[PDB]
Design a protein around this ligand. Structure first.
Ligand SMILES: Nc1ncnc2c1ncn2[C@@H]1O[C@H](C[C@@H](N)CC[C@H](N)C(=O)O)[C@@H](O)[C@H]1O
Ligand SMILES: Nc1ncnc2c1ncn2[C@@H]1O[C@H](C[C@@H](N)CC[C@H](N)C(=O)O)[C@@H](O)[C@H]1O
Lengths: 239, 249
RNA sequence: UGGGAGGUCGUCUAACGGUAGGACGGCGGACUCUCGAUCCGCUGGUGGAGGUUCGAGUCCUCCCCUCCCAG
């Protein structure tokens, strides 16, 4: 099985950033992931290929023009066939987190609408969009980076391609040399005992989650081992 | 004129064309309002195999970035940037980015962004070369390039002259700490839905109040937590109260 | 529907008793853009009757509608 992602964007070339590079790029070459794009501009019918328009009530800025965007969405929705969910990238949507990523991952086909300018017509959101998703509480100039972020995150779940895995931040990592700028690698990682290492790393993940993002610890049911190790870390932090 | 410089450390510098050749950010670059320079650790690898990943102690998942190429790239960039440059590591273990953080980061004249790949980077490079760690969200990506581009884009909207003449009236979410109001454009009736008459009224004061009320109502219904510590005018309190009543009962 | 005040394009704002303008909106067009930028046309008004005056947005009367002050 593979993942198919439809994208509606005025700047499809931006998507090369994920399709021609890294793990996701490798995913594309092996046909494990396909990303098809439709450009509202290819759907205009005028001399200047207009894809934006003025918002009613005046004031500055522009919105994406309704017709080209709509036609692109219907065309993409068509090509996608039955069962394809249309998602609009927006700061007012559901904030992405690992749970949202896994849910989005269930879907076999998705179509991602990338806004530009001041956004899209509200009626298109009500009539064509199934779900709105935000990548964070901040505003960007467009939805392409958010779309690629979502794609990359879900792409990690495609067969043949873990922090947050258990609700915890990842542990610290080390590689050669044994000593770097007077800093030595914790002896336990070189001890070669898989069990001592596993326990040390788990304790570190727990300590970091507690110290940097302690709130990520309310919704979890720690195992006896996790509760014990966390208890130890808190004792070490301020004795 | 207004200018900002962003140094980037990345194995895939070409990814950055996504924010430098396109849109508002592309024009900002084309007008020298925003400058992005990229150093690639692969160009600093002694390894004859242009190898940039090394094995993690303890065995485990994946590979880590090789220390020497990454370190040399960071020192070269830091040296080129000169003094006063803040070094940031993109990582999910970092401070979660939000609009307040974007304004704060936007307070820097020079920044260097380190983009990880594979399982990440040696913790000691973080302790010795990194000033701050930032995450774009509670989810895991294959690399720091998208997060870096996200950070750059987010701060770029705040560089004067980027959006154009009087961007102070340009409306986006979080700009004033509230979510944006809904927007409408031509045609007047599509898929049975009509544009709210007030926006066609030409009545300026009512439109200002409508927009403000919509922003308050939408923020209240979708992200009420933002409303927890917000300085508000008498008018916003009144308008918000009207909206809360209107939906309830 | 008691006592005050007031009516000009859709909105805001001008005009001595002398040919009713401007800004924004709305419609449409140029930039030759990826311009969330900037320009340019077109649309459109004195609430209604009387009366004074050579002439009324302006002054007088009545009618209507609107705001403020206690139903
Ligand atoms: N936090 C975000 N998450 C996902 N997409 C975003 C985010 N911020 C901006 N975008 C995209 O950027 C496009 C252009 C934005 N300037 C529009 C913002 C819109 N006016 C709002 O505040 O809701 C939006 O249509 C979205 O597609
Ligand atoms: N949410 C995020 N915010 C910022 N950077 C991220 C995010 N997710 C992944 N990255 C970066 O992209 C790469 C992700 C992977 N290397 C895995 C990282 C590993 N889980 C860690 O704990 O660092 C690293 O460079 C991360 O710093």
């Amino acid at each position: 099985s593979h993942m198919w992602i439809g994208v509606i964007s005025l700047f499809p070339e931006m998507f090369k950033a994920i399709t021609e590079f890294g793990v996701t790029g490798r995913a594309v070459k092996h046909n494990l992931l396909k990303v098809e794009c439709w450009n509202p501009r290819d759907f205009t019918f005028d001399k200047h290929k207009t894809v934006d328009d003025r918002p009613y009530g005046g004031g500055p800025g522009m919105l994406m023009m309704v017709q080209p965007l709509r036609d692109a969405i219907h065309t993409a929705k068509a090509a996608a066939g039955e069962g394809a969910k249309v998602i609009y990238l927006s700061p007012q949507g559901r904030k992405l987190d690992q749970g949202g990523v896994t849910e989005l991952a269930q879907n076999q086909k998705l179509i991602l609408v990338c806004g530009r300018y001041e956004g899209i017509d509200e009626r298109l959101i009500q009539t064509e969009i199934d779900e709105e998703w935000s990548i964070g509480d901040y505003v960007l100039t467009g939805g392409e980076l958010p779309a690629m972020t979502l794609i990359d995150a879900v792409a990690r779940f495609i067969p043949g391609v873990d922090s947050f895995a258990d609700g915890l931040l990842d542990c610290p990592h080390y590689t050669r040399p044994e000593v770097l700028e007077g800093l030595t690698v914790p002896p336990v990682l070189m001890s070669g005992h898989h069990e001592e290492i596993r326990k040390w790393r788990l304790k570190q993940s727990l300590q970091r989650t507690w110290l940097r993002r302690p709130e990520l610890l309310e919704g979890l049911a720690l195992t006896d081992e996790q509760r014990k190790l966390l208890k130890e870390a808190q004792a070490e932090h301020n004795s």
